[PDB]
Amino acid sequence: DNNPAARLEELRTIMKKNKIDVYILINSDEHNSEIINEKDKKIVKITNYSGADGILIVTKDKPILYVNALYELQAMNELDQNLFTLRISRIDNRDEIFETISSLFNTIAFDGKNTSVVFYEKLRKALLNAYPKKKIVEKIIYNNNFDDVLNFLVLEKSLVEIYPVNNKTLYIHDRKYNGACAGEKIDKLKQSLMYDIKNVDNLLLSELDEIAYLLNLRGYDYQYSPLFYSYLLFQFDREQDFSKIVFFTTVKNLPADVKNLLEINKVIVKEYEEIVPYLRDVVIPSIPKDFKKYDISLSPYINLMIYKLFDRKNVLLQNSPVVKMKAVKNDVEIDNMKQAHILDGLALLQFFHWCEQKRKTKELFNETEMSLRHKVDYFRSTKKNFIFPSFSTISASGPNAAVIHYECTDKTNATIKPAIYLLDSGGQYLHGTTDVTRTTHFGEPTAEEKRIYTLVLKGHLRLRKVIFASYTNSSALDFIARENLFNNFMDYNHGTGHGVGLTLNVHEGGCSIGPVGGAPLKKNMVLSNEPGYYMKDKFGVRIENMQYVISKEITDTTEYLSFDDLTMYPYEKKLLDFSLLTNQEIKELNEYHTTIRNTLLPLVKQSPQEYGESVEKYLIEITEPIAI
Amino acid sequence: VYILINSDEHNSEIINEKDKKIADGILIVRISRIDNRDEIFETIIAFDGKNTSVVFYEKLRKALLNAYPKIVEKIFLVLEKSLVYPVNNKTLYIHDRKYNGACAGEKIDKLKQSLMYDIKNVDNLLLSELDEIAYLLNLRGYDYQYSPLFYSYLLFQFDRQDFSKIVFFTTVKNLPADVKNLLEINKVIVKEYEEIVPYLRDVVIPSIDFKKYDISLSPYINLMIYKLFDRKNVLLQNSPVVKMKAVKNDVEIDNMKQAHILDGLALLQFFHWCEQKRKTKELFNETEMSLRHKVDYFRSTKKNFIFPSFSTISASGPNAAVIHYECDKTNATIKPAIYLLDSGGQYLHGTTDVTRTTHFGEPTAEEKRIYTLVLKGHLRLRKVIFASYTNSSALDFIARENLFNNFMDYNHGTGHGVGLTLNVHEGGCSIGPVGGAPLKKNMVLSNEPGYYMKDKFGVRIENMQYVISKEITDTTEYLSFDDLTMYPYEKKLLDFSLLTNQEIKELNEYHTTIRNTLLPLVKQSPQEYGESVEKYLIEITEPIA
Amino acid sequence: XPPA
Ligand SMILES: [Mn+2]
Ligand SMILES: [Mn+2]
Ligand SMILES: [Mn+2]
Ligand SMILES: [Mn+2]
């Protein structure tokens, strides 16, 4: 059964032969990707815990696994707790793991590729004030030679080695989709280095979405984002342009038309694994010895390996200027995002149309969560310029809808019931990235269900149309999405909205709508709006749109902003509690539903082959105006 | 390039006559907005070492270094003697424990703990904020007009281990005899006020990867004390006392309530006076000044009253559009129009701040609409239920939203913290668009949305309230507020087309609560409050149908 | 899904 006690008792020996006392294993990769590929999942092979968020301290005593609160009920069900000590991380306890590992051992090791500098420093600075007497000697271990050694050891290669290789080639993201040339974007980044960042002439881009966005390239190295393993190094020459641009990537996956076009900036192209020896040997020795000058600017979550090549005093950890660059879409991008959402609405329509028909036949109740998940994914795949799903589809019936990130498996699959059904799904298109949730009911809704839905919907409708002065902090917008739940002493354990990339990652930084951290929003930022509520062992609801920031009104004194919709799919009338709904909400519902009918109905009618009249009747039905 | 600021050596928002060389302003040898904040440093050498804060100076020199890249600075010149008055001989006095709930030694102990755990990289701390010292020592004074504070410095030195020395700099001729006991009782050494620079220079400073600082200073400290150190060794931060008195203990809240009851009684007498005179047309021979003197008078007769907590804003008609309006050559006759009263007082019990807007004529539909839009955000903030992690800037938003829906806004913050017989504007918490943090139980905050129209009129509705724990569920703590301020709102100014049934219910609840609280006190003293006063109180607390 |  791929035994862990076996692999653990095996590991404890390899730690021993290396004189390595305490070993930290974390689920992540060297690009700080939310979703990691298989080659990077080490934790699961040792614990049988396949959950994405987790950290593994491996010691002489009983190993400890930290996981996030959202993954806990899966870790109890997965992780055997006789072999491994289980523990949860919460917003409460966050630093507990730092406290813990401070509480045990004179030799410690880390995967240099799989650890962020953030984790490392917080730990290292936990052990500074833990044991002021002990001296910390940090070392990068190259080619399993430990014979040169508080020892902090950054490991070049993992002690856990492993999976499919991707041979598919990179492709250009055409200007018609992205609205701006790679050259223009690189010229903007150039301007940032002149004006904004004057204390650094060297910048490394480690975030894959930033590199893809800037070069207008996409790739196949990840299942849910069209990204590709890469680094992009910039070296600035003050007296006022780029000295060199070095692109590290998988060269065999580099097509011919892209290489010649990479003679346009005269970009040097290296292989991916050469980033470390190139920085170590070529870059760093070249940098010469009131106002402080830094050797290099790295992203905040840059992997430990790349970081340790420098002297910490000379590294500057901050966002790339690309972060703000991508957070504000240009109009071509917005227009393209609208087309992607239009295509998605058509796909949702087919999916729920099909559900509804099978609901009548009652064949819907021999279906499973997995079956329904493949169907919506299918309907999206028949859409023009569709690449693949933008994340793993959440298809959850009844009680499983209370599990926020719930994943059906061939193993974990449930029969569809005449109950709450939650569908969180999205797609990657040449036109953009989409993320949408709708909650519906296949049975007779209970009073509690309607009420929970409507209280979630009220927060959601409010955030669709909210009018706010331009200075307003986005944490205020997060609050009004929760108000109606607050009034009932109810809350949801996640953020209200995140930024979203154009054909990049479904979760993009640079802006958000959430309770902790927040900033003012700018026009043509794209954000999700997704309040929810979750009742364990019963059901849950989430309602999610994507929308973008528009200018609502400008007076002599003040600029007011609002949002406009990207997502076009209606809400569920069977779940409405009309005792909770003001007429302004009902009109807003009606105005939205009519906009949907105006948009999608003419597209439906002209592909009667693909859609047909049962579909348009269904569309007309779910968009019919509600009575005041 | 000379830079004159209106501030004193202690970063007081309301500065004495000694300090006014030019309230808020900066002189350089154009308005400043939320977007435009840094405009001045981009716009822009000598400074008043007494008047200039290291935040402004460091921000300036840094800005200067961005362009034009090397500056020389000598005490950039820092003037000890400033380029470009009455004295206070009145005695300091103990603030009794019955009011503040914590002995000055109990506070110091709490402070000593901050140095063991929270601040491990410096053993010397200088308190320059007058309210922090007053709060810590449970002492008050007459050095300022609207705040019961005194010119002082307080230096703590830590043995790492315990406090090795505590030295208190002040005006010793205002230090009384029973107080000199409490100073040796905490084993404090007492020095004079002008001794600050000499003591730091010629005594303290001769002493002392992972770094240790020499001294911790408050961010807005004056340059004269700052430049006594090399920048590297000076750690700029809020003292521990800022979060200590931002959270009132329960005795403090109880006393704060009593202060507001007395204040409700003074407002009740004041507006009863206005109203009798309205009936007789007599009110319109009165003035903004006489109404001002009148309300200050009615507070002055309340028990344990000290003086007004800030300069009373008495504003008629178009003047109500001036946010900061200050009554001699500015004085205007009272009209049958909007009237705005922003006032409060210092009591042994606490500090009050209240604004009510009323109308002595017949309100126009515009006035009522504006008043009601303001009131709606006011009422929302009164009773809002929020998860304890909620950033206060969100609370600021909902006091604005109804105004936002009509594309209106006010150019100030929604709320600030309030001290206990201290500054009426206290740091440690706020409700505002820019700075924000989660609120905690027993924080005391103002709630004061408004709207102002040049040459027409303005409206502001202000209460003090404090944070309470509303509900604790498995996952979450929900917070809300409870009222301090007890005074009704103006029924004449209500637009009932904008008001929900929930707002009416809450109005009635508030007004009946006010009646239940004030009325038995009013009846206890017929000679201070007539039968006319009782009837008037009863009429303004009557339920809206 | 949720930003968390
Ligand atoms: Mn006031
Ligand atoms: Mn106030
Ligand atoms: Mn989603
Ligand atoms: Mn989402």
Side-chain angles (χ1 to χ4, degrees), chain B residues 366-440 442-459:
Chain B
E366 182 188 45
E367 286 156 1
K368 296 164 66 176
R369 162 176 184 84
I370 287 304
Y371 179 93
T372 301
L373 286 162
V374 160
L375 181 67
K376 281 171 69 80
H378 176 89
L379 290 177
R380 176 74 175 112
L381 188 53
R382 265 188 80 243
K383 286 309 171 204
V384 62
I385 295 161
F386 53 101
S388 68
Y389 56 73
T390 304
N391 185 295
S392 50
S393 292
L395 299 192
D396 171 87
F397 171 79
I398 61 185
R400 295 173 194 281
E401 55 185 348
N402 288 106
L403 288 174
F404 278 178
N405 290 6
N406 301 272
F407 308 112
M408 307 172 302
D409 196 5
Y410 47 105
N411 272 349
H412 54 80
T414 300
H416 55 77
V418 191
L420 189 91
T421 326
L422 290 170
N423 297 338
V424 64
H425 291 169
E426 185 176 70
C429 52
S430 71
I431 310 172
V434 182
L439 304 184
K440 302 193 181 74
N442 280 9
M443 270 176 174
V444 171
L445 295 148
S446 79
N447 153 25
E448 52 186 319
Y451 181 80
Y452 314 86
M453 274 169 158
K454 167 186 167 45
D455 294 313
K456 319 224 305 182
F457 70 95
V459 165

Side-chain angles (χ1 to χ4, degrees), chain B residues 310 342-343 353-355 448 462:
Chain B
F310 61 92
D342 191 347
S343 50
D353 190 342
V354 206
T355 307
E448 52 186 319
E462 176 185 23

Side-chain angles (χ1 to χ4, degrees), chain A residues 391 435 494 507, chain C:
Chain A
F391 56 87
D435 187 352
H494 58 75
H507 293 147

Side-chain angles (χ1 to χ4, degrees), chain A residues 424-468:
Chain A
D424 191 354
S425 75
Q428 298 284 359
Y429 303 85
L430 293 185
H431 295 298
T433 298
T434 73
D435 187 352
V436 50
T437 313
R438 289 296 185 264
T439 303
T440 182
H441 202 284
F442 293 135
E444 268 189 270
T446 74
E448 180 179 44
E449 286 164 345
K450 284 194 251 288
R451 167 187 182 81
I452 293 305
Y453 182 90
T454 302
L455 290 163
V456 165
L457 189 68
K458 284 169 79 61
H460 172 82
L461 292 175
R462 179 73 179 113
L463 185 47
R464 270 189 76 244
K465 292 314 211 182
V466 57
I467 296 169
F468 55 108

